[PDB]
Symmetry: C3
């Protein structure tokens, strides 16, 4: 829908076209995270109680468990239709986000309560990572923080150091650990009943070592890194065991869906001449095109890759009528901002040819040494190999190809919009 | 003041009511932070000088000390009124923020200079945490970084490793430490004469272990975690000893005050029908109500909890007249934004009943299988148990209660405002 | 150009004047960063392969190398003019930012390929930091992560711990390392062909220890800390050796240039009386003045110091005509915002004298105890030592000097602009 040949006359140069992708329905796996380390390897020091640490955890876990228990009590299985019934009255107030998550919680807990049957086997581990066998032949991946520090730095020195020295080292390392998770699972976790908690925030519970988790889950996808960086991989707390201080976390792993007839087009903005002074247009850099319709896209929440835009949601936004008219060729409605700085692009390469403002900078033909000048009635000069094979702009020598489009481009005039301030 | 029954007709559904709280007058305690570690346990390696490290610290501490000394010199005790006199001429230019802090500095230094009498006892420590006894029977809590690393990882290996290996390990760990505090106490600290430096930034001087500090200060309050996350706990540098490279920090611990007749009301926004297309209103999610007056609140600087909003300041903001008229029932002045995405809430639960847009999604009665339809003249359909006990929205079964309010709600019509773009 | 005596009547009080500085042409040095550690000290444990780690690195390095190789192939040396010729056709689409960087890449690689001749000597190191001698007598600084951990924590325990315990410790520490650099050199690195990648992001490849790097480069400048915090020090990836898994990084070290006749003037904003209610003006806090012209400055991207503003670019922005008229004395065009909070400055010191709103707060003369009152027709009261030597504002005693300017200030009236909402 965008008329590029005319928009380039006001500094909007067609850039790279990318496919639009949004995540779809996830698969899921359950893991167990243990918050209290095994310190029996330090049992030569009888003054270690771990009592203060347990109390500190209660202040975090109980406030959370009280919410999970509410939704778990409110939902029951369903009859003309199959499904799960959630009690609107019991909740009183709920947004669609928590209603949907509440249903997911109900289903997830049907397995979390089976994992809990291993609570004694979960507590009885001393490795940073352990694999427990379920009665059904399934495998539970247990991730415990602190164990690496204890096993490598404290236990080996149990005879070398004094017991007061070891206790001190342990008390400090535990308070450091607590400070780290408090940030994620403390008061900042407004409502645990969600399916969109970033896995990179959850991973803070074991040092922020996201790679360790992904390797254990067994995610080997070639695009795994893109799913991770786009924040498409998330998890949910489904069960908390307060006595043994461990959590059951469900990890959701999305399937990326490419949207048909949908892509994101970027524009390269350079300055141009209007009346002797230098101006830059105020058109959004990224435009989302679907079927044939123009809309805005909030790229700040998406991952930009070599050939695609990966979003965890559809971030399309409404576009004004004046901007749509601008993009379709009515350049009289494209707003301008004055340039008061030196830090502005004055040239770009697109389609193998150069678009440049040769009044604000100097353009010379390498072959002859002659200056490539534009008049005061022109916005931008377009340079191709029918004009000069190699052009020197500033002190950069750029070779060019042929221009595909109108051959009267440099004799074409364009109207401009009004000056605005932001 | 807000008329909820009419606003719900345009997708503004009453949510959770929270109390408004702002911090009041703090109490205070003094701590000492030492920047240079005790490496005499490594005195078998004679090539350790710590000289380069000291020079690096000078580049941070002197620029700060030069400001503290200025205010300390400018303030003197006071006479019709008691108090402290600050010299406006000596300062030349000062904002109220620094004038107030300057007075606090004067008072704090009356104790910091008494702590400094222990400068030899402060330097003569080798533990990460030490408690020194003052002549008056008071206790000074000394927190030192690096000591944990040195005592646990370097000293125990003094005979096992070569002295060049140990020196290298120490030089690297010190440069890592320096890099961390440089971030907080370097050029980014524009002016040290303040009472609002976050305690979580100060804690970077000893690894970011905020829990260690709080445990030593003896803060056991049940709401301590909320005070910390709301950034209500702050500190001030009151004294710097350049020769022995340590700082005296005053920690301010606020008392939360609940504001009478003041609360924050949240609204849940869902889409609604206007003319066949789908729209969302542009009314702020959080409204601050005081006595009977409406105002805006900058929630981005406050902590949102289950039943309160905790702010370090009063973040009330002016509200326009058109928005006040909107909120009090004149829905013709409530601006609309078009929906161009699929990622929008189309239903919510409030008061035990469901508000939903049954044109954009499908609503069925579980009991009969019949569709619950709304006409093209309606914005939203409200569903209660006088209509259908269990309603299937999408594929989620929700049970409902009775609606408290007008029983003619679903036959009531509302005017809407104009379309706008943002 | 700013008329301060009249603007102070509406709460805009002249603050501190700072010089405007922007970075100029850099010098450069090359360093080598190795991604795979030397684990031959652990060769008693035969189950260490490092194979999985290598594959994980390939997923990061290859996507980057494919871009560097493209620009390296496109550029060739140049003939009426000397220089480097870049192929616009081969690239197809490029912004000025990448065209310029592409030229820098060409030149840098002329040395990177000479460093690569030491690829066997680079791999054959086991220290965290090593200095290799080039055939030309030059020195290559090789920085390797992981070596500190391995040499200090794993190797010394090779006989003490079981080999399965050591392998586990190594596998975990490597996955932690990978997670850290993935953040910087993964998908978030949209295009490696740039000269503006922050050195503090690059330093993440070796723990974020920026001080270690700077010490090795030999930067001893007194203003080094300001260059670092202002983000003026950057680097570029010039060469990647995939077989030996190391990168050659060029570090650019800028020369700060003070701009003639250019400075940034800050204004201190306090509230004032208009008609009995309290108001605050909506004029930008920082104004950039060049020669004699007023413009806006985006201070959010600059470092503010005691006497200067240090920017990596020129961040001047256009200023509206209504604001220029406001600043030059037409106070009728200076917009007002209502105060609905208690958290607002009501006084400030500038020029040794006090400007205060003595209707919203209480002002008393220390010497006599009498109240210093202003009428309802006045905005602000200015207090100097010709009125009262020491004034008590709130409970703060401030001494004053003489006012330099009109002696009829307190009998001068000012017009105000219209109320606005934001
Ligand atoms: C435990 O600590 C106490 C001091 O509080 C000490 O007297 C006791 O000997 C310690 N226990 C052991 C086994 O050392
Ligand atoms: C959930 O139900 C159990 C009884 O089965 C009860 O003990 C628990 O307190 C309830 N939790 C909540 C939040 O109501
Ligand atoms: C600690 O771990 C050890 C070794 O796995 C196990 O024998 C012991 O039962 C565990 N103890 C606790 C308290 O979990
Ligand atoms: C200009 O470039 C095109 C390829 O883009 C080529 O076919 C044509 O021959 C070239 N013309 C000249 C004069 O170099
Ligand atoms: C200190 O370092 C020097 C090398 O600079 C070395 O010759 C000397 O032996 C070292 N001192 C000791 C006690 O090893
Ligand atoms: C403060 O006064 C002392 C003398 O008591 C002087 O040595 C010091 O330099 C002064 N500091 C400042 C910032 O003026
Ligand atoms: C280092 O600490 C030790 C043990 O507390 C003490 O004996 C010594 O005086 C301290 N030395 C220095 C230089 O502070
Ligand atoms: C509807 O719910 C209310 C409680 O909110 C209950 O008192 C009433 O009997 C219910 N009516 C029906 C038909 O279920
Ligand atoms: C390497 O690991 C295997 C188990 O996978 C073990 O059987 C073998 O003994 C180990 N090698 C050595 C030298 O211990
Ligand atoms: C660059 O040229 C070399 C041949 O010299 C080729 O092997 C390599 O694949 C080319 N790289 C790119 C990106 O074209
Ligand atoms: C590892 O480092 C050692 C000691 O510098 C060196 O002898 C050896 O060749 C290195 N091995 C590898 C694989 O780089
Ligand atoms: C007021 O202060 C000035 C210096 O700013 C001084 O010269 C003058 O004598 C002072 N006047 C009185 C009455 O204190």
């Amino acid at each position: 829908a965008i008329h590029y040949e005319t928009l380039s006359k006001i500094g909007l140069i067609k850039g790279i076209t990318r496919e639009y992708k949004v995540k779809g329905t996830p698969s899921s796996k359950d893991i167990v995270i243990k918050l209290i380390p095994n310190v029996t390897g330090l049992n030569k020091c009888t003054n270690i109680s771990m009592e203060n640490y347990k109390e500190q955890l209660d202040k975090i876990l109980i406030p959370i468990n009280n919410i999970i228990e509410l939704y778990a009590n409110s939902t029951k299985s369903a009859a003309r239709f199959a499904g799960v019934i959630i009690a609107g009255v019991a909740l009183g107030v709920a947004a669609a986000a928590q209603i949907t998550a509440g249903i997911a919680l109900h289903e997830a807990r049907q397995n979390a309560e089976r994992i809990n049957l291993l609570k004694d086997s979960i507590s009885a581990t001393n490795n940073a990572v352990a694999e427990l066998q379920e009665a059904t032949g399934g495998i539970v991946n247990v991730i415990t923080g602190m164990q690496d520090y204890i096993n490598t730095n404290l236990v080996p020195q149990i005879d070398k150091l004094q017991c007061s020295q070891i206790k001190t080292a342990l008390d400090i390392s535990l308070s450091q650990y607590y400070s780290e998770i408090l940030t994620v699972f403390g008061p900042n976790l407004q409502n645990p009943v969600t399916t969109s908690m970033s896995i990179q925030a959850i991973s803070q519970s074991f040092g922020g070592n996201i790679d360790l988790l992904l390797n254990l889950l067994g995610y080997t996808a070639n695009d795994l890194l893109d799913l991770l960086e786009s924040k498409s991989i998330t998890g949910q707390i489904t069960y908390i065991n307060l006595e043994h201080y461990f959590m059951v976390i469900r990890v959701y792993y999305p399937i990326m869906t490419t949207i048909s007839n949908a892509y994101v087009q970027e524009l390269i903005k350079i300055s141009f001449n209007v009346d002797g002074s230098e101006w830059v247009s105020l058109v959004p850099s990224y435009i989302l095109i679907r079927n044939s319709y123009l809309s805005n896209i909030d790229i700040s929440e998406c991952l930009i890759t070599k050939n695609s835009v990966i979003c965890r949601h559809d971030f399309a936004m409404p576009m004004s009528y004046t901007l749509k008219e601008c993009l379709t060729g009515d350049t009289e409605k494209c707003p301008r901002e004055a340039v008061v700085t030196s830090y502005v692009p004055r040239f770009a390469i697109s389609g193998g040819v150069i678009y440049a403002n040769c009044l604000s900078t100097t353009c010379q033909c390498y072959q002859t040494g002659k200056v490539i000048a534009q008049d005061g009635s022109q916005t931008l000069m377009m340079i191709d190999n029918q004009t000069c094979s190699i052009v020197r702009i500033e002190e950069i020598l750029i070779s060019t190809g042929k221009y595909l489009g109108s051959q009267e481009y440099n004799t074409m005039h364009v109207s401009v919009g009004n000056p605005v301030f932001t």
